[PDB]
Amino acid sequence: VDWRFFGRTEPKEENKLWFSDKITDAYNMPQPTFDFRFPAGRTSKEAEDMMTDMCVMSAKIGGFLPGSLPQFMEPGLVLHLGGTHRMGFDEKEDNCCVNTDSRV
Amino acid sequence: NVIQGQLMSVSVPVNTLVVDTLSPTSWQASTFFVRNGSNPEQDPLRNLSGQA
Amino acid sequence: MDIKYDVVIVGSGPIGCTYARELVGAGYKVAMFDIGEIDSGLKIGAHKKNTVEYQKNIDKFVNVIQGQLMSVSVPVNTLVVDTLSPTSWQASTFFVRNGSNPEQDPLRNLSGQAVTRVVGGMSTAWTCATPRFDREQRPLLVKDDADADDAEWDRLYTKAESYFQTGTDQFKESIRHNLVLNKLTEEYKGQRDFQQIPLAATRRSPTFVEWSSANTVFDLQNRPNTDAPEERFNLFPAVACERVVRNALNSEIESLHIHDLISGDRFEIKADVYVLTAGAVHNTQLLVNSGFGQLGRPNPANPPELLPSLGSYITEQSLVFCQTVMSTELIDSVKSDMTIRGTPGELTYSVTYTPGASTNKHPDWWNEKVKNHMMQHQEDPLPIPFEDPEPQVTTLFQPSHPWHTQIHRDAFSYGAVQQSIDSRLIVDWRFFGRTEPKEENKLWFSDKITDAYNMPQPTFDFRFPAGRTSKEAEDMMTDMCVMSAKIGGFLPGSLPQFMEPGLVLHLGGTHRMGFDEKEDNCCVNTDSRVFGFKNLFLGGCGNIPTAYGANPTLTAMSLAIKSCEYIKQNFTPSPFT
Amino acid sequence: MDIKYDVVIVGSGPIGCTYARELVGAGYKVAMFDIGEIDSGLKIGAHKKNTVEYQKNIDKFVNVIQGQLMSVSVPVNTLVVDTLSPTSWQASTFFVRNGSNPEQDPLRNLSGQAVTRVVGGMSTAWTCATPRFDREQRPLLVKDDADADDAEWDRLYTKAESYFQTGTDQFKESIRHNLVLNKLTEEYKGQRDFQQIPLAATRRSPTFVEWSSANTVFDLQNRPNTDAPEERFNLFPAVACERVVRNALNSEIESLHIHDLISGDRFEIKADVYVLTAGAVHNTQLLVNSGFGQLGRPNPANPPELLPSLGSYITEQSLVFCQTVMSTELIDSVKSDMTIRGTPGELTYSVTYTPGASTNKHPDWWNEKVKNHMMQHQEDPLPIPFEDPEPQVTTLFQPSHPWHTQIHRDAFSYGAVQQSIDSRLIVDWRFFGRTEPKEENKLWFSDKITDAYNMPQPTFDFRFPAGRTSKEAEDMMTDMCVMSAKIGGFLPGSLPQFMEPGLVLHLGGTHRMGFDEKEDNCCVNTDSRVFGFKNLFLGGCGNIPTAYGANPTLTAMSLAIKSCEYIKQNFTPSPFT
């Protein structure tokens, strides 16, 4: 049986996806560049509590399969990226790019 | 394999792995230069390396 | 080499040395044979980790361990190599090669079980953890009287602790030790107690710990000598002991048959008292080779005439392991009492504290080390001193957490990627389970295959017993996962895992103790005397008949001390001539 | 411990032991210091492979080797670990961690270089191959007189060979050795000669070889003693020699500064004659720490006052490696002479040979071994006896194949899948290239970073020179692929490959010899005396100034012998009062 637990990550202004003004990608578009770390505080404590939860809960079904021991996956492997063009009610107050009808 | 075959990494930092068992005749780098589509903007310690 | 001694001891490990210390000290004329050789420097049988080089390069010591551990039973290899050149010679079958044991069922093995053959035995490389067993783990020495059983154990353990130089204070001022200790104390307040692992060791300076060994128990120097002019002892390395010779009545041992490995000659040695301390595996091998028990695949249709419990009820502990990288919170806590002003490398960088202030979370000795490290190494991003010793923390076995624990650092071979992580961050976690003795779990010896010393090949038939053993092993894994997350997350490459069976090397019960041979299914009595034989004694973890999770050597030494009390009351040392 | 000797020697490896053997024997009062400790049993500085246990479990010896090899220069680690828990403390930069050397360019390293600190030095673990250099590889000891040069090198090598007990006969009756040696002799008939590797070793029994070491050269016991009542010698282990003190005129050494690692005491030792034999790396370190050469990153705009060539022109050999799995054709050839009646295991099975017949491809000693093996082990599918010794074959360096070669078995750690292949089938191949001395190839010492003993941290700036060295190294790889294929295909897991630079441990040239300091860009003369200094000598492969492929230790020892002749002719022993 596979176990995958997914943690939520607090939106922080310093976590960014930006694009190079020199380097380009395979389609000649500005090369994407991340500046990301899991925020300290809640996101991090909950990630490690989630790991422990997986360890505890999985043991009710059976022990770990050698070669697939409990581990955090490489950042972004999960492909659940959000917030890159985020929604809110007020551009300034809610630090956002689109409104609730998703219009820029 | 199908999944892997279509997931193209978003940002791969410059590679700094040392290969020091090339034959003496092979051409060899004096620096870790921008090679193989890697992104020199990317700090390898602040990446989403698994993003594709 | 004389032909006749008062006492012969097979094996120069810490248990053989306990018998030596006690019997040499009482005036007996003693010889000790070891199949292995002197190679620990001028201190014979001493701990190999005590060189200045290994105390400066502690991770290299893993190689010393691996270099002297030889696998007990390796099943026939069935790995397929199908990329040989067409010209190379290729097998049509998986035949017996490379010393593999075709008796061995690969799914019922202790594949990690291994033995050492060097003077000092495994004590030249061991980790030195010597906890006492509580009652739950401990064999009875006195029946129907728990207070007297308690008192007898206390007396024997106290003496064994003096022989090993056990203490709990050699790491008392390590920052990392106290950081983990204090955190776990707080997290489990009112639920579990934490302390230093009792270690057989003496600190000689801030960067040097003299680890104890066989040598600490008995220095293994031939006697008489200048410091012991009245004592008699001879050590004979590179002598494989092969058989103790039974009289026809099975009531006495008549001699010991040896094979001098250097001359290649075989001889007999006579003694009044024969003590076997060759370890849990080779004691059993020697006995089986001498006609005790049953040679060959065990067969209930044909139960052995002598010691039918020999090589049955064997126990080996389950062991789970991981490493962690210290949490940001804990690391930050290390410098919580500091006032930090300016920036590193600049003239105005200032790290100070107030010695003695009530609000300080740490003692002055800790703060001063932290201040000095941060001021003298402004380029380093960690507040822990470079030379800060290892943590050595434990919460001892209890009914609500029936496993032994070690939260510590021992020598380790880190992969290149792991070496990317500063070692000051890394903590090892090892939790040890107890294993119920079960008649079906067996160490037996082949009647056909022999080992590298031409002796019957050891073969295991082992699985962790269903029921309590298995349940607690899995619960133990969970507990390690929960407890370790309080200190930091897992180090990639050292994720929580069970270790290969027997890698832990805490094998017991192979020649087990009890009050009554039949009723307690055992091979020796509480004096360690083999049932029916006046003059044959067994020492070592093989005597231990219980399910235990704590490290067993200190308990085995305690039984050896008790055995020696019996010997001293029942045999007379020859006159000194 | 006096503080006045006739001769002090730094280092107890085989080269220091050569100075000791010569000078103790000639009547000088000798002290030797070694930063490491005694750890080969009662024979001080003896080969650690000479225990019965290692010769029964030879592949375990790899751990002994690894356990005492400490990497000289490890660059800062930039491996990314991005699967830590979010709670774990994490670096923003690849900071200087874990004893790494921030001076070290990771792309201009000898990452494989290592040192050993034990009494006996690397000779407690070495492979014992001692070939002579031919002229093309050898430094000149006599100018403009080829025959006189040859005679001098003959006399020195013959003496060195006696000290090491070098022989070419210890494997003469191995079936595997002869199988490979005869095949390669045939294949290269008229083209190359093959022979046994010259080995410093004496066979004691069909299953035991006593490998030579420092102890062979000089037993390292304190003198006077019963067997040497007129000799004077003291060995002091665990003493870090740190500097030799120059007089103001730079014409004489005045003392040796030491640091006793056990007491912590720091003294000055006085002698008539100072000999440095701490190895190619640590001789250079000691010299640089004493004010010779230049400390810190090479700056050719500030050339050093003393020994400007010190630490330049370093040479390390290219090493290529594979293993092979013996061909079907060769294995079948082993039993070429046998008549095989019937079926293995079945009742009438016979393997027989006619002794001394003339169609027989093999000698009677071979056929008899093969016969008894096939008859006694009918379940085994190979004709080679189980206890048959390793192959030990070489074709020595020549202009047309200017590499040293060893086609043999030394201790190896086989992967699980490799252990699937029967070891009787496996042969190691190691071919060793010669490297041109080039001024830009350097060993230098940091003026800021220090090693584990608080000495200036060694840093390499090395690449294999373009031109002949690189072309030959690649030619050499091809040659190994071509020749190995005559014996069998590559063992998966041990495919042809260049080893990490410096792993070979044949570093030379660090304090190189020549006739004239300036013209020959060297540090010592042919008496191994440091230019300008009356009483300081260096010994070791650091003296060798040439490009050589063969293993260098016998050549270094020959140079040390010559050096001692100068000493005997120039310094008078103290009266033994």
Ligand SMILES: Cc1cc2nc3c(=O)[nH]c(=O)nc-3n(C[C@H](O)[C@H](O)[C@H](O)COP(=O)(O)OP(=O)(O)OC[C@H]3O[C@@H](n4cnc5c(N)ncnc54)[C@H](O)[C@@H]3O)c2cc1C
């Ligand atoms: C890496 C490691 C770490 C360990 N850590 C701990 C720990 O922290 N705490 C703990 O309690 N225990 C630990 N141990 C286990 C502990 O070392 C053993 O329990 C202890 O050494 C047993 O002592 P012994 O005298 O019975 O047997 P050994 O130490 O095994 O000695 C047996 C001796 O008999 C000799 N011998 C074998 N066959 C023959 C023969 N036929 N003829 C003559 N002589 C023979 C052997 O050479 C050996 O010297 C560790 C072991 C290892 C290797």
Ligand SMILES: Cc1cc2nc3c(=O)[nH]c(=O)nc-3n(C[C@H](O)[C@H](O)[C@H](O)COP(=O)(O)OP(=O)(O)OC[C@H]3O[C@@H](n4cnc5c(N)ncnc54)[C@H](O)[C@@H]3O)c2cc1C
């Ligand atoms: C596994 C291996 C296999 C090898 N096989 C071969 C082979 O087959 N043939 C061959 O020719 N060579 C071989 N060698 C290389 C050979 O062992 C060395 O060439 C030889 O040992 C060098 O001799 P030495 O006396 O100059 O230096 P070493 O043997 O290096 O001894 C130098 C000594 O100085 C001591 N020392 C270091 N620093 C200090 C200090 N500051 N103060 C006091 N003492 C110090 C060290 O402890 C050491 O004992 C092998 C080496 C290795 C390790």
Ligand SMILES: OC[C@H]1O[C@@H](O)[C@H](F)[C@@H](O)[C@@H]1O
């Ligand atoms: O590998 C990460 C993925 O694995 C699956 O189990 C999920 F359903 C996904 O949401 C996710 O993209």
Ligand SMILES: OC[C@H]1O[C@@H](O)[C@H](F)[C@@H](O)[C@@H]1O
């Ligand atoms: O590798 C298993 C070993 O590891 C240590 O940490 C222990 F203290 C031992 O008692 C044990 O034998």
Ligand SMILES: OC[C@H]1O[C@@H](O)[C@H](F)[C@@H](O)[C@@H]1O
């Ligand atoms: O691993 C490198 C070593 O391997 C052996 O085969 C050699 F004989 C040595 O000269 C050498 O130092």
